DNA sequence: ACGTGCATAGTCATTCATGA
DNA sequence: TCATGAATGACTATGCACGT
């Protein structure tokens, strides 16, 4: 039996736990804004073919695929993570298209795994766009059987768009969601002004990203906290719901709340008001009624007494309830395996860098493949030019190896090209098919020229990011939900 | 007559309505936590209340009364309906003039219906006699046209009919997404449940009628009673002709 | 609102429930001895490739695959069914190879889905043998997307081997497990004596099937109940565990129980004795100690008092505990969609009939496929004899449609055959490659003749069933576990 | 001598030996692992106490709340000894307390939470060397013809593989080397032959040298002060590798 | 009254950091 | 004290038929 000192054990064990939670659980990678479980769920569904071009698969199949290949943990919590990514009040831009009961903004829990179905959304398809073209580094999974991606291509700035919240060890993150069109403008600027320093970049990006855009709409009051978050990486952003005063024919004024701030439980909110009125903390209120429905959305009617001023009661609601509540921004993300608090100009720049990497890697891959096919095509054209001779040679061979070896001698060919000639069908010996082979060579040589040009010119590379992203935003971009007002 | 609805002495599972008038109120007794959850969301909270029931209901024909009254699900039903049972039945205290039983279209939904109807017929018969009991018919299919509004079908025949008509009308469907087939209420969301089983202007309800009480008494005892032999011979005798009951 | 009478509703609904439960849930199909959930689990795993020729897949993947394609029910209970099929003390011949914690014969529950892995056993591979050769009818699944098998090939008598127990409506089944080698002998006899009547067949089969063979070993006392079950379809079979009396250095005696009868919970058994001791029912017992382990198996030590007789205490144990307990046999199975209580000769005969169906259908499938291959090969051979013309024809054709249409006219060939000529690779134009096409034709024509011969002779068909089964038994057959003694 | 259950935790699968000096308590992570352990153990001398979930941090949590925790009560009750000032080592029901958790990081975390409970409530158990740590296997080499071998590290895996191949043995490239990701994935046999068989198990005895230094480290790592912990990790995690070099 | 096996998931308690 | 969100699943009750 070996002896171990308690200080040695404690320090090593706790540090190993803390570091894994920090880098590999609770905090998002800055490039795609994803935690490990998120990335693994999405890739599992992707590889399984659970895409928008086919009907929803049973969500149990996504959980089991993620569990069995990539995420060595429980089926219960993995399902929770998948479900959250499908809720429109949780994600500003949902990554999972859910079919069935996925719960509500209140205390209505999601249906069990057996009842629900799921597939990837079109935007989630942009997260995984061309991932199979060596655009990101892959590593072996938890048991060496298969490969998994270290990061997704993420062809739209997902970290800033959908945000992130996570509790780690020694630190925590809380990044709010943003409007995609505003983020795109910032990226477009960063691409054009690629040489601008941080001071200019921060000023520019802050001008285009007006503030967080929550899926739950509501209001942002003030501009100080927003400025702090972008300039410091920390800031307190005051949120408010929407209140509309309605008058009755009898003289019974009532407050109608139709929106609430981000991450405020509807049922808890109603209960909080109800409990604060029973004990006596919000006088002036006469009656609370939830007239909400699937057809009118949120609609909490708060009838106030006749000897009460509406604005007073509203301020009391701001004071003693989450009708007014602050978002504690802490822009913490993993950068190159290291946790870092980032300015807004740093977040944009790091994403733009990732995109440029993705485009260059894609181009290199396509260029390699283009050369390979061109190489084989060059072989085919040689065969076509001497077609009469090619056949006669293969006929007299005892094996296919003698036929091949001859082809090399006849036309000056590789082993790959000669093999490709051998595998050739009589199908392609028709007139148009022979011409198709010729034109295909001409096509690829044109593509190779284009591809080589891209690699040699950073200008085009940046151009690609801009144009492709622009296409994404035009298709999947939406209006702002959260309204920004002054003090 | 009016009675108070719970808002922050009734079952915890009950999602009561807001209307205090029983004549205007409805109780949807739902199968499963998921389905009840969706119903709670898609309902009209003014007049429609939801009481989800979990698992197969206890057979009041086989089990002794004391055991039945200890069952949490039975207590929920009796308590929510407000009326007593047996001799202490008082229809005046009925909290809902519409008791809609809503179960899956599958075979296990049918079984839960017979167990609930047995509870009602044995403990609270006047509810059936006065036409306060109904059966909701869930949809089986949802046709998702590419450009037109989606259509719901409550049988294989209607599915074929709506499909034929729409195609004849020049509409089109994906052969991938296409026709969604429901295998239970739990697979539906809030909107779908409203537009097929809870919207009073579109819902397909069946009102349970009681003609011959003595004949009914016998059938309940045969099918639900402790006598297995009687039940076995009844099934082997009559299952052959279940198709031809309405021909 | 439509009116419906309560009598119509009750009758229609309950009958619909009862019949589906009878035919499609609780009771086994006579041909493969499987309930729907069993069949659907096995086929799901089979189709997924979770076979003994590969490492165990996470059992969560098997459950989700079963749920998503075939069995529209809960994941929880489906996992239970899968777990049962992997327990050596439940199934006489396990169909699932389990890896991890699958519970124990006591109250120790199996580990959760997340912890365990599973794959098919070699015998389960015989259940599904050649299922892809149209040996069984397939039907669309619960939503029409995919096909599922109505019954498995079941190349060994699984119903009698593993038995079955099920609670339906108006009836229930309880078939005990049997020894594969004894069942095989019975099958071998039924095949040889294919014209024997029920009277003779029953006498023969009862001679070879000596009685049930439980996975938990133990003892069968008497022969009447066994004879009743086989002649009537109902019988009470008396089971006993094995007790070995041990003496001590002091001279104290103790009873050692190392086996218990089928389906007796070890922990409940120990608890029952413990409660019947204090309850002053089983005097003479001094101490109860469970000395069981993973290495010695069951070992319940019952130390008895000095003024106690071993057999008296043993007889008391037989009387007042499940150390002696009877198996209530009720040979109920679904035959052609109808529940039927069956004699032993009926069970064997119906299984033999199924096998013969499988072998004929397989032969028919192979014969059809052989003709197709032969048909195309004949086309290729025609092309080779006029190869100079064929090539010249395809070359001079502007399209492939022109080439095809020409080939039919040139060689007097079908379109399928002509298509095959077009799909032919330049490889197949080599000397030795041309020769293989000829030989392959000669090869297949021999195979076709053989297959036609099998279909024409019932003797061969029966011969195949015998020979193939014999191979299975020699490979997977084991010794008898349950010992049969007289009164 | 002490009575074994046949007034203790319901989760406890006690041993049969009435001698604490020979008795052992395996504190296990999870219901699955504890279940298999209960089967593969030697029921004579080895008892199993499965613990469910993350253990409550007695450094952060208030005293009364810790005493309400079902898992803590199970440990305190099973060990027989009191806590703090009412600690009496004479009533120790097992002279060997083996903590057995998954090889993963969450197992390591549960170890630090248990060690914190012991050090703060029942320190003498550590001082007198009654606390041990079982080292689970990481790999199982499944040779085609030979008996299987277990490995407790990546290095040992490479070594046993190298030796076996050099000896002429062979492995499947499909089944091959099974990698354990937790105690819950193991069966009864596997646990016995790697962590519970006293002639093969790899135990580490927790020793306590400097009590004052330990006291500070526990308070830094497990205390409510985040800043102290944050700076400690960023300061020392860089050199966690080189603690035993 | 208990076992059997295929059918009909929510509740329960902790770590961890931060702000009410 | 409570919410956040990924991490570490056993227990609870009915139907149905049958035998002790
Ligand atoms: C048994 O421990 C758990 C508990 N509880 C149950 C009651 N005692 C406490 C100590 C743990 C829980 F209240 C929820 C979960 C879960 O929600 C859960 C999951 O996978 O989601 C896993 N576990 C167990 C330890 C892993 C949970
Ligand atoms: C909620 O109903 C269930 C209950 N109980 C929980 C509380 N008392 C009764 C009402 C039902 C149960 F004690 C076990 C299960 C299960 O074991 C189970 C399963 O999937 O195996 C499914 N369900 C629910 C209704 C379907 C179960
Ligand atoms: Mg949980
Ligand atoms: Mg259902
Ligand atoms: Mg269950
Ligand atoms: Mg673990």
Task: Decide: C276 and C290 in contact? Cβ < 8 Å.
Answer: no
Task: Decide: A118 and A98 in contact? Cβ < 8 Å.
Answer: yes
**Which residues are CB-neighbours of A451 under 8 A, at least 6 positions away?**
A363, A366, A367, A370
**Candidate from A115, A291, A293 with C-beta closest to B186:** A115
Q: Which residues of D touch C103 (CB under 8 A)?
A: 35
Phi and psi angles of residue A236, each rounded to the nearest 5 degrees, phi first:
-105, 110
Packed helices B228-238 and B213-224: angle between N→C axes, nearest 10 degrees: 110
First to last CA, chain C: 69
Nearest alpha-carbon partner for B99 in B28, B204, B202, B205? B28
**Candidate from C74, C395, C429 with C-beta closest to A395:** C429
Task: Decide: C200 and C344 in contact? Cβ < 8 Å.
Answer: no
The finding on whether B73 has its CB within 6 A of some atom of ligand 2 is yes
Mapping DSSP to helix (H, G, I), strand (E, B) and coil, where does residue A22 land?
helix
**Residue D85 designated active-site:** no
Distance CA C163, CA C176 (A): 5
Distance CA C58, CA C62 (A): 7
Q: Which two tokens stand for residue B49?
A: 């209340």
Distance CA A256, CA A317 (A): 12
Cα dihedral angle (C415, C420, C422, C423), rounded to 10 degrees? 140
Apex A177 CA angle, A173 and A183, nearest 5: 115
Mapping DSSP to helix (H, G, I), strand (E, B) and coil, where does residue B139 land?
coil
Which residue shows structure tokens 């195949």? Answer: C464
Sort strands C117-120 and C96-99 into parallel, antiparallel or unpaired: antiparallel
Mapping DSSP to helix (H, G, I), strand (E, B) and coil, where does residue B32 land?
coil
Q: Which two tokens stand for residue A330?
A: 């802490």
Distance CA C17, CA B114 (A): 10
**Which residues are CB-neighbours of C445 under 8 A, at least 6 positions away?**
C374
Chain E positions with a protein C-beta closer than 7 Å: 3-11, 13-20
Task: Decide: A228 and A236 in contact? Cβ < 8 Å.
Answer: yes
Protein residue closest via CA to atom 23 of ligand 1: D53
Residue C265 CB lies within 7 Å of the nucleic strand E = yes
Distance CA B163, CA B179 (A): 9
**Considering only residues 59-98 of protein chain D, which place a Cβ less than 7 A from any atom of strand E?**
60-61, 65, 68-70
C340-CA/F18-C1' distance, Å:
17
Sort strands C242-247 and C234-240 into parallel, antiparallel or unpaired: unpaired
Task: Decide: B117 and B100 in contact? Cβ < 8 Å.
Answer: no
Which residue shows structure tokens 């309400």? Answer: D68
Sort strands D24-29 and D96-100 into parallel, antiparallel or unpaired: parallel
Mapping DSSP to helix (H, G, I), strand (E, B) and coil, where does residue C175 land?
strand
Task: Decide: A476 and A180 in contact? Cβ < 8 Å.
Answer: yes
Distance CA A359, CA A247 (A): 58
Distance CA A271, CA B8 (A): 7
* Strand locations in D95-232 (E): 96-100, 131-134, 139-141, 149-151, 177-179, 203-207
The answer on whether D227 is annotated among ligand-binding residues is no
Distance (Å) from CA C76 to ligand 5 centroid: 6
Task: Decide: B153 and B139 in contact? Cβ < 8 Å.
Answer: yes
C33-CA/F16-C1' distance, Å:
20
Chain F positions with a protein C-beta closer than 7 Å: 3-11, 13-20
Burial class (CB in 10 A: 0-12, 13-18, 19+), D4: middle
Residues with CB under 5 A from ligand 6 (ion): D 102, 104, 182
Distance CA C415, CA C419 (A): 6
Task: Decide: C138 and C153 in contact? Cβ < 8 Å.
Answer: no
Which residue shows structure tokens 């929770």? Answer: A80
Sort strands A483-485 and A219-221 into parallel, antiparallel or unpaired: parallel
Distance CA D12, CA D15 (A): 9
Choose which residue among D52, D55, D57, D107 to substitute to test ligand 1 binding: the one with the highest number of ligand atoms within 8 A of its C-beta: D52
Task: Decide: D114 and D99 in contact? Cβ < 8 Å.
Answer: yes
Q: Find the largest Cα–Cα distance for chain D.
A: 62
Q: Do B38 and A271 touch (CB under 8 A)?
A: no
Distance CA C220, CA C223 (A): 8
The finding on whether A77 has its CB within 6 A of some atom of ligand 1 is yes
Range of the domain at A106: 1-487
Q: Which residues of C touch B111 (CB under 8 A)?
A: 13-14, 17
**Which residues are CB-neighbours of D68 under 8 A, at least 6 positions away?**
none
**Candidate from A65, A67, A421 with C-beta closest to C426:** A421
Q: Which two tokens stand for residue C14?
A: 């309950």
Task: Decide: A325 and A279 in contact? Cβ < 8 Å.
Answer: no
User: Resolution, rounded to a tenth of an Å?
Assistant: 2.6
Distance (Å) from CA B54 to ligand 5 centroid: 13
**Which residues are CB-neighbours of C392 under 8 A, at least 6 positions away?**
none
| Smallest CA–CA distance from D32 into chain C, residue | C111
**Residue B31 designated active-site:** yes
How many domains does the structure of chain C reveal? 1
Distance CA B43, CA B28 (A): 9
Q: Do A143 and D181 touch (CB under 8 A)?
A: yes
Distance CA D106, CA A17 (A): 7
Q: Which residues of C touch A399 (CB under 8 A)?
A: 430, 432
Packed helices A344-385 and A198-208: angle between N→C axes, nearest 10 degrees: 90
Which residue shows structure tokens 């170890």? Answer: D111
The count of other CB atoms within 10 Å of the CB of residue C232 is 14
Phi and psi angles of residue A302, each rounded to the nearest 5 degrees, phi first:
-115, 95
**Residue D104 designated active-site:** yes
B105-CA/E7-C1' distance, Å:
15
For chain C, counts of helices (H) and of strands (E): 17, 18
Task: Decide: D220 and D229 in contact? Cβ < 8 Å.
Answer: yes
User: Using the CA of A325, which nucleotide's C1' is the nearest one?
Assistant: E20
Sort strands D131-134 and D96-100 into parallel, antiparallel or unpaired: parallel
What DSSP letter does each residue of B126-166 carry, written as one string? Answer: HHHHTT-EEEE----EEE-BSSSPPEEESSHHHHHHHHHHH
Q: Which two tokens stand for residue B221?
A: 């005892």
Task: Decide: B47 and A293 in contact? Cβ < 8 Å.
Answer: no
Distances (CA, A) of A199 to A193, A231, A344, D36, D177: 12, 10, 11, 62, 55
**Residue D88 designated active-site:** no
Mapping DSSP to helix (H, G, I), strand (E, B) and coil, where does residue D220 land?
helix
Distances (CA, A) of D82 to C20, D74, D120: 60, 12, 12
Q: Do A426 and C431 touch (CB under 8 A)?
A: no
Distance CA A313, CA A318 (A): 9
Which residue shows structure tokens 């040489």? Answer: A195
Mapping DSSP to helix (H, G, I), strand (E, B) and coil, where does residue B228 land?
helix
> Which technique?
X-ray
Domains, chain B, with CATH or none:
1-247 (3.40.50.670)
* Strand locations in chain D (E): 24-29, 46-51, 96-100, 131-134, 139-141, 149-151, 177-179, 203-207
The answer on whether D102 is annotated among ligand-binding residues is yes
According to DSSP, residue B158 is labeled H
């Amino acid at each position: 039996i070996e002896p171990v000192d308690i200080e040695q054990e404690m320090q090593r064990s706790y540090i190993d736990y803390a570091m894994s939670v920090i880098v590999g659980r609770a905090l998002p990678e800055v490039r795609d804004g994803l935690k490990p479980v998120h990335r693994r769920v999405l890739y599992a569904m992707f590889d399984s073919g659970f895409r928008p071009d086919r009907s929803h698969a049973k969500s149990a199949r996504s959980v089991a695929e993620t569990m069995g290949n990539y995420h060595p943990h429980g089926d219960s919590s993995i399902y929770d993570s998948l479900v959250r990514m499908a809720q429109p009040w949780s994600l500003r831009y949902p990554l999972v298209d859910g079919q069935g009961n996925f719960g509500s903004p209140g205390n209505d829990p999601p249906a069990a795994m057996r009842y629900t179905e799921a597939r990837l959304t079109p935007l989630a398809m942009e997260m995984l766009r061309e991932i199979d073209e060596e655009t990101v580094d892959f590593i072996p999974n938890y048991d060496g059987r298969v490969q998994e991606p270290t990061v997704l291509p993420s062809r739209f700035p997902n970290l800033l768009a959908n945000g992130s919240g996570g509790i780690a060890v020694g630190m925590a993150t809380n990044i709010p969601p943003h409007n995609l069109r505003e983020l795109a403008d910032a990226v477009f600027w960063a691409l054009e002004n690629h040489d601008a320093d941080e001071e200019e970049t921060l000023a520019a990006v802050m001008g285009r990203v007006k503030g967080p855009d929550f899926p739950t709409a509501g209001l942002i009051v003030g501009s100080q906290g927003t400025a702090d978050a972008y300039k410091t990486g920390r800031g307190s952003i005051r949120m408010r719901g929407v209140v509309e005063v309605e008058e009755d024919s009898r003289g019974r004024t009532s407050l109608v709340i139709t929106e609430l701030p981000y991450q405020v439980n509807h049922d808890n909110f109603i209960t909080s008001i109800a409990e604060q009125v029973r004990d006596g903390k919000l006088a002036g209120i006469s009656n609370i009624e939830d007239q909400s429905s699937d057809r009118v959305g949120l609609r909490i009617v708060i009838e106030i007494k006749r000897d009460a001023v509406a604005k007073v009661v509203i301020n009391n609601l701001y004071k003693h309830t989450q009708l007014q509540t602050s978002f504690g921004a802490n822009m913490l993300a993993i950068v190159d395996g290291v946790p870092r608090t980032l300015r807004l100009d740093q977040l944009i720049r790091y994403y733009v860098d990732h995109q440029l990497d993705v485009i260059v890697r894609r181009t290199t891959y396509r260029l390699r493949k283009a050369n390979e096919r061109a190489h084989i095509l060059r072989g085919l054209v040689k065969a076509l030019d001497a077609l009469d001779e090619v056949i006669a040679l293969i006929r007299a061979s005892e094996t296919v190896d003698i036929a091949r070896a001859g082809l090399i001698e006849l036309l000056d060919i590789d082993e790959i090209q000669a093999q490709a000639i051998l595998d050739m069908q009589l199908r392609r010996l028709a007139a148009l098919e022979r011409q198709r082979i010729i034109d295909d060579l001409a096509k690829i040589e044109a593509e190779i020229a284009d591809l080589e040009d891209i690699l040699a010119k950073p200008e085009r590379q940046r151009g690609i990011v801009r144009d492709e992203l622009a296409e994404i935003v035009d298709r999947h971009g939406d209006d702002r939900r959260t309204r920004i007002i002054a003090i | 007559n009016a009675l108070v609805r719970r808002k922050s002495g009734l079952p915890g599972k009950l999602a009561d309505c807001r209307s205090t008038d029983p004549r205007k109120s409805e109780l949807y007794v739902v199968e499963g936590d998921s389905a009840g959850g969706s119903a709670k969301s898609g309902r009209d909270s003014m007049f429609q209340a939801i009481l989800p029931l979990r698992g197969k209901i206890i057979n009041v024909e086989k089990a002794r009364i004391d055991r039945v009254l200890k069952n949490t699900e039975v207590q929920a039903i009796i308590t929510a309906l407000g009326t007593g049972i047996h001799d202490e039945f008082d229809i005046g205290k009925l909290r809902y003039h519409k008791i809609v039983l809503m179960a899956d279209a599958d075979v296990d939904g049918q079984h839960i219906s017979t167990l609930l109807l047995t509870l009602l017929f044995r403990f609270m018969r006047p509810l059936i006699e006065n036409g306060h009991v109904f059966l909701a018919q869930p949809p089986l299919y949802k046709l998702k046209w590419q450009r037109s509004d989606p259509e719901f079908a409550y049988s294989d025949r209607e599915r074929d009919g709506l499909l034929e008509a729409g195609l004849k009308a020049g509409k089109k469907i994906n052969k991938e997404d296409g026709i969604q087939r429901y295998k239970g209420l739990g697979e539906m969301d809030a909107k779908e449940l409203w537009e097929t089983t809870m919207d009073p202007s579109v819902r397909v309800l069946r009102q349970v009628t009681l003609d011959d009480a003595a004949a009914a008494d016998e059938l309940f005892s045969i099918l639900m009673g402790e006598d297995v032999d009687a039940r076995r011979s009844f099934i082997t005798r009559n299952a052959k002709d279940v198709r031809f009951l309405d021909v």
